[PDB]
Design a protein around this ligand. Structure first.
Ligand code: CAC
Lengths: 15, 184
């Protein structure tokens, strides 16, 4: 289901 | 802030199968960011429970088939934000990770999100407006049926009636992050 990639440092654990 | 950050993980199999989480995972998981932890089980010992308590002061664990602590509940249903969430290790689901058995559980539990483990394989999908999450194994521990396991864990950002599911994976020697949106 709708699996989009996430740019470096945009996940909650990194800022 | 205003977001609820929920860590989802399990099947560490520490120390019998693995001694620790990947060093790069430990750098990401630091105190003071996560509100709740939902653990599918197979820690397998108090040291790992203790470690989880350093990451958040609201820790939920269900009993795996290799857990030492038999006081953990067999399954658990909790509410976070607008979402009702069900938690089961999954070795009770017959056959392993059948989508039909899981959907049965969802109706039995009456949850928006059904979390389970035991297969050591990350999955996150929507089936009949219901959301199903398997965090995989945060240590990459082998199991029966599979030995080449990608270490992973899930982070749920709950806000209003959207859940944003981040999946963290150690692929090669680096962390790769994907996201899946689910609406209530
Ligand atoms: C080993 As059991 C009671 O959690 O299926």
């Amino acid at each position: 289901v709708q699996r989009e990639d996430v740019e470096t440092g945009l996940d909650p654990l990194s800022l | 802030a205003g977001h609820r950050l929920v860590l989802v993980l399990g099947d560490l199999h520490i120390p019998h199968r693995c001694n620790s989480l990947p060093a790069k995972f430990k750098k990401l998981l630091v105190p003071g960011k996560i509100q709740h932890i939902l653990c599918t089980g197979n820690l397998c010992t108090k040291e790992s429970y203790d470690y989880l308590k350093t990451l958040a002061g609201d820790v939920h664990i269900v009993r795996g088939d290799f857990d030492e602590n038999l006081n953990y509940p067999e399954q658990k249903v909790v509410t976070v934000g607008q979402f009702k969430i069900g938690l089961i290790h999954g070795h009770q689901v017959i056959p392993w990770g059948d989508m039909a058995s899981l959907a049965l559980l969802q109706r039995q539990f009456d949850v928006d999100i059904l979390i389970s483990g035991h297969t050591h394989k990350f999955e996150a999908f929507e089936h009949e407006n219901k959301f199903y999450i398997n965090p995989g194994s945060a240590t990459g521990a082998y199991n029966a049926l599979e030995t080449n396991i990608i270490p992973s864990f899930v982070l749920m950002d709950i806000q209003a009636s959207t859940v944003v599911t981040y999946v963290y994976q150690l692929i090669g020697d680096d962390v790769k992050v994907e996201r899946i949106e689910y609406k209530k």
